[PDB]
Design a protein around this ligand. Structure first.
Ligand SMILES: *[C@@H]1O[C@H](CO)[C@@H](O[C@@H]2O[C@H](CO)[C@@H](O[C@@H]3O[C@H](CO[C@H]4O[C@H](CO)[C@@H](O)[C@H](O)[C@@H]4O)[C@@H](O)[C@H](O[C@H]4O[C@H](CO)[C@@H](O)[C@H](O)[C@@H]4O)[C@@H]3O)[C@H](O)[C@H]2NC(C)=O)[C@H](O)[C@H]1NC(C)=O
Ligand SMILES: *[C@@H]1O[C@H](CO)[C@@H](O[C@@H]2O[C@H](CO)[C@@H](O)[C@H](O)[C@H]2NC(C)=O)[C@H](O)[C@H]1NC(C)=O
Lengths: 162, 59, 54
């Protein structure tokens, strides 16, 4: 079993911008878009955002998020309006903390900055929470899934399924 | 009667030693199954021909 | 270790929640430990960050 679902209502965060896009991820047409399940939040201005969630479903939930590594103070200021921005995401009893990191990288797809992606599993009747002051890409959508015992893996081929 | 076969044998970029361990694990089973399969067929084929000879002699 | 057997030692490093909690426990916004065993060096710089309450 595998279902995409909406996990976070992004409209409930104030004094901030959501659904931010970039030309490095165009539509099929062209232009600027972003990952469907991941919501880029900008202009936190140092303010702290709090979110809590409980998996009341009868299946574990897979959520994927991202942490923005800016290039310099100017780029950090433009995107978030503050030389801060740190996220702590807690799943069950694990704590994941992503402090602000500012550093140039080589330019790929017009980006000297980076967005690094992480993931976790929220078991049924378990909780997860997010505390962020910026530089975070939220797991707006997630997948409820049912594990199977026999693990297969990935088949690498160019062919189509017959 | 075999366990479920898997192709998940990938490790990250800084874990090449673990990938080599997986590579030589499959090499070990390849050598074990190949050698046992060869001598199984060789032994049984000789016994099968002897089986027919015994049946003919028994008539 | 002048004994004729190896010694197992276990230590811990405290990660405080905020500046106030760091000040109450240690009276300074510092506190870092370097423990060296043989030729290995283990350095644990001060880390201040909230975690979920357990
Ligand atoms: C994950 O991967 C594993 C490994 O592939 C799967 O486990 C196998 O599952 C199958 C089917 O469930 C098993 O096959 C069954 O074995 C039963 C027991 O067999 C022993 O006992 C009988 C006498 O009762 C002997 O005849 C036999 O030789 C064994 O000594 C059988 O009773 C089953 O019979 C079924 O099939 C026959 C036709 O073949 C029918 O006539 C019967 O009515 C019946 O339907 C069957 O043979 C197999 O043994 C399992 N192997 C292992 C290693 O676990 C998992 O199923 C898989 N998981 C998923 C979700 O797919
Ligand atoms: C997961 O979150 C839920 C909801 O916040 C927690 O359950 C609530 O706890 C409060 C007390 O703090 C009660 O007043 C509510 O009635 C509870 N709600 C439900 C639905 O039971 C729950 O404790 C959290 N789980 C963990 C492990 O902290």
């Amino acid at each position: 079993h595998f279902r995409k679902e909406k996990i976070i209502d992004m409209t409930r965060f104030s004094d901030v911008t959501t659904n931010n896009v970039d030309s490095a991820c165009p539509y099929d047409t062209n232009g600027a878009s972003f990952y469907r399940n991941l919501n880029w939040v900008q202009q936190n201005k140092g303010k702290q955002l709090i979110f809590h969630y409980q998996n009341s479903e009868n299946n574990p939930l897979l959520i994927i998020w991202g942490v923005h590594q800016t290039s310099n103070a100017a780029e950090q200021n433009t995107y978030y309006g503050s030389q801060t921005g740190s996220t702590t995401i807690t799943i069950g009893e694990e704590t994941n903390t992503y402090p602000l990191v500012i550093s140039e990288s080589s330019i790929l797809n017009g980006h000297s900055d980076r967005i690094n992606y992480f993931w976790g599993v929220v078991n049924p009747n378990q909780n997860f929470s997010i505390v962020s002051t910026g530089n975070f890409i939220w797991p707006e959508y997630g997948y409820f899934f049912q594990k199977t015992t026999n693990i297969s893996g990935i088949i690498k081929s160019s062919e189509k399924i017959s | 009667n075999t366990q479920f076969e898997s192709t998940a044998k990938e490790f990250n970029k800084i874990e090449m030693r673990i990938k080599h361990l997986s590579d030589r694990v499959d090499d070990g089973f390849l050598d074990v199954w190949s050698y046992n399969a060869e001598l199984l067929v060789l032994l049984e084929n000789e016994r099968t021909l002897d089986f027919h000879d015994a049946n003919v002699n028994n008539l």
